[PDB]
Ligand binder design. Structure first.
Ligand SMILES: *[C@@H]1O[C@H](CO)[C@@H](O)[C@H](O[C@@H]2O[C@@H](C)[C@@H](O)[C@@H](O)[C@@H]2O)[C@H]1NC(C)=O
Ligand SMILES: *[C@@H]1O[C@H](CO)[C@@H](O)[C@H](O[C@@H]2O[C@@H](C)[C@@H](O)[C@@H](O)[C@@H]2O)[C@H]1NC(C)=O
Ligand SMILES: *[C@@H]1O[C@H](CO)[C@@H](O)[C@H](O[C@@H]2O[C@@H](C)[C@@H](O)[C@@H](O)[C@@H]2O)[C@H]1NC(C)=O
Ligand SMILES: *[C@@H]1O[C@H](CO)[C@@H](O)[C@H](O[C@@H]2O[C@@H](C)[C@@H](O)[C@@H](O)[C@@H]2O)[C@H]1NC(C)=O
Ligand SMILES: CC(=O)N[C@@H]1[C@@H](O)[C@@H](OS(=O)(=O)O)[C@@H](CO)O[C@H]1O
Ligand SMILES: CC(=O)N[C@@H]1[C@@H](O)[C@@H](OS(=O)(=O)O)[C@@H](CO)O[C@H]1O
Ligand SMILES: CC(=O)N[C@@H]1[C@@H](O)[C@@H](OS(=O)(=O)O)[C@@H](CO)O[C@H]1O
Ligand SMILES: CC(=O)N[C@@H]1[C@@H](O)[C@@H](OS(=O)(=O)O)[C@@H](CO)O[C@H]1O
Ligand SMILES: [Ca+2]
Ligand SMILES: [Ca+2]
Ligand SMILES: [Ca+2]
Ligand SMILES: [Ca+2]
Lengths: 219, 219, 219, 219
């Protein structure tokens, strides 16, 4: 009746990929998400998808807090929703990647959260918790652990520049990044430095991936 | 106890037309609506009514998001409420029309929604989903399918002008419209082009209707 | 467990006057009110009290929407809360008055509501519904029936002036008033015209009352 | 399932100190707090902690309303949350203090609340209710009883200056204080007057304490 996430949806007997209502502990109004019911037995709540460059990801603080795009296509679920999900239980993160040569890879993180113990996660900049990498894509996220989220209009990074403005995205920037999955949809190899859909451990700092999906499941 | 819409109110044993409390899945505070318990067996949730020009419909974004007028008279229920209703289940739309010669007609749409898969339906402009026309008024809505909602202060249409400013209303404007039920209450035939309560397939682009009601019921 | 008003509190077995939690149908977070468990068998939800001039009632729109003062003393519960109460059921209004000569009187209204059928009661100005007077104070409210609420910063009255600015209060002003229980605490007879705690049918337009209480109970 | 505070968490069978979900009567979304399950049998809800000066406490009104820092470290839970907790039942306050010589002391108050009967506790400035001192630190809070909360940008104190600006903190200032646990983390004895983490009855007006924790439990 009130699944808290896509794993509750799966265990209630819904086996199809698609859009479902979930109701996190501290977000009782609930909201709709895309559930991946296939990957590693299923029950994954999607919070980011790139697939075709139809949606603008070069967005400000309010858009990254509140979410944008469509659940059936390219979207960012919103940091307020990702906080409501990742604080209610211990989640793992799955990242699926595809290049423009139909190569695929994945990274799995045994631990993932945003603003986990922040009294005001927005004020506190939704800081990243991430640990325990496995998979085929290589690790491009551990270096970001403990970093606040930065947008073009709200700088909490460890550059004297704004990493989000400079690398044309929004991420838990350090000085500045090994991943940038919210970067410009530049479609494969590019001359500009690290400002595309980058997962550096797989395809370097000058290759914008075709497809990315970031999704969570209780450990 | 907690009907999600006017069909739940009807099936609970309330047979009179009137104002009732409903509680959509993702709007658990609930709100009051006018229920039509008569049309095609009843259970219709009203979200728009024109009948006498007593209410100003030439309103900005905030008014069309939040609603205006009175449930017992002319009103717009508000796109945030229409989103909360149409995303909780698959709805049909019924449109009742009356001209100033006591002629009536209706359009039925087997599928209707606003911002159905939008992460932020407001940001995304509450885009229209509508399909499967039947009735006596003719179809004046299918051409609007997939269009964002436009007001005089927020332009998401496919004109290089603001369709809402120009046609003095608020609608899912393309370039620009075949219907304008939120247009000025100009009372029948008028010289100005398409800026009245227009349903073009029935009464052309220069006839402001006396009465309109837009209402929804689960398929 | 979840009384909707002070009558539910009374019928649950709480017989003492005081502050209690209530949970209106469309305000499920609930809030605290002062319950009068004595008047005419009890179960009255207080929304206004004057007794000593310790609280400033010459306040703007936001203060009259959101409430001010303290539940144990002078207060205005707030029009958003009075709307949440009066729309969930059919309420009567009781007004208790006291002059500075220890005279008391009361007015009872068989019907009372604010913004009863308004889609956006705030936008719509929380219009007064009131009918069916009885009691000792005389009727000073029926002439206000159907009038929007006016403050010094938001004019919806039927003067070409701002009635709230002019009569130094906040009320459902026509042109302008027969009651002004939110007026200045001027302490009895005064030279200024109708700008005190006025109930004109009892003590005229130049007498500021010592005590007023406005409270509601389901019919 | 829905503990209202850390005492409900304890009595449900959770004996470890740590972060838990609580759901106050008028804050039904709930939020996370740090529970002290050890002090005097346990069940204490933490709302303030100083331990190392890593968090800036010289913050404005919005930060003191909404909370800041992290539940596992230095934080202020936020006056809106402290109001939601202290109005749902009768609470006692426990204050644990430590100096830089590993001395500890405590103050216990048999009665504690903020904005207890305020219709709008924010407007009303979250006024302090506190009574019935016992413990080893001495009383440095009773003189503040009945005072509104003051920040550098919102002055409700009884100085003709802003006590919060002057003593570089945020507190229920009179003219001005005997305690300032939200003051600058100045680390022990200091030349500046009363602008550190001060508990005057224990360590005077020129000694910034190493550790403070303010926490509540139903009487
Ligand atoms: C990558 O996978 C997709 C599967 O959807 C295929 O469309 C691609 O096939 C290529 O494009 C289609 C239109 C067809 O002409 C086929 O012959 C092509 O090989 C596939 N391969 C590549 C390299 O993109
Ligand atoms: C349209 O229907 C309404 C039903 O409410 C009628 O009021 C109209 O009747 C006309 O107006 C009334 C006042 C009366 O004089 C009658 O004789 C008229 O025919 C009716 N017809 C039209 C053409 O508007
Ligand atoms: C009005 O009622 C109140 C009841 O609380 C009384 O205080 C008033 O009594 C008057 O004031 C007190 C202090 C005492 O001196 C008494 O002798 C007075 O009559 C009472 N009467 C008036 C006229 O205010
Ligand atoms: C205060 O208590 C803490 C307990 O955590 C101790 O760290 C302090 O011990 C002192 O510092 C440590 C690093 C060690 O060198 C020890 O020998 C010291 O006495 C303790 N004492 C003081 C005075 O701070
Ligand atoms: C996008 C980004 O941050 N790229 C950095 C690059 O700037 C530089 O690091 S740098 O901190 O010295 O600038 C480089 C060598 O160290 O490593 C990369 O990961
Ligand atoms: C209100 C409105 O939009 N009216 C259009 C009109 O502008 C014009 O279309 S137009 O796109 O060429 O301008 C016309 C012929 O095509 O069709 C109408 O539906
Ligand atoms: C406060 C107020 O409104 N007082 C009016 C007064 O202004 C005048 O009415 S007036 O509409 O002509 O001005 C008078 C005689 O009619 O009646 C009073 O009730
Ligand atoms: C921080 C603060 O307020 N310190 C006051 C100090 O200012 C002065 O009091 S004072 O009201 O006269 O200024 C003093 C003697 O009375 O007592 C202290 O508690
Ligand atoms: Ca920077
Ligand atoms: Ca346009
Ligand atoms: Ca006026
Ligand atoms: Ca001051």
């Amino acid at each position: 009746s009130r699944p808290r996430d896509c794993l509750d949806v799966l265990l209630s007997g819904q086996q199809d990929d698609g859009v479902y209502s979930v109701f996190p502990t501290h977000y009782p109004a609930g909201f709709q998400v895309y559930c991946d019911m296939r990957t590693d037995g299923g029950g994954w709540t999607v919070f980011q998808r790139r697939e075709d460059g139809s949606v603008n990801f070069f967005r400000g603080w309010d858009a990254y807090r509140d979410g944008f795009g469509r659940l059936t296509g390219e979207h960012w679920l919103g940091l307020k929703r990702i906080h409501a999900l990742t604080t209610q239980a211990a989640y793992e993160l799955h990242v699926d990647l595809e290049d423009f040569e139909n190569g695929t890879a994945y990274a799995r993180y045994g631990s993932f959260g945003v603003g986990l113990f922040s009294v005001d996660p927005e004020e506190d900049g939704y800081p990243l918790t991430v640990a325990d990498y496995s998979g085929t894509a290589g690790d491009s996220l551990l270096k970001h652990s403990g970093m606040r989220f930065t947008t073009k209009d709200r700088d909490s990074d460890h550059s004297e520049n704004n990493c989000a403005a400079f690398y044309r995205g929004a991420w838990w920037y350090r000085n500045c990044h090994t991943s940038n999955l919210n970067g410009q949809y530049l479609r494969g190899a590019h001359a500009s430095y690290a400002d595309g859909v980058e997962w550096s451990s797989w395809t370097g700092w000058q290759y914008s991936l075709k497809f990315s999906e970031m999704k969570i499941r209780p450990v």
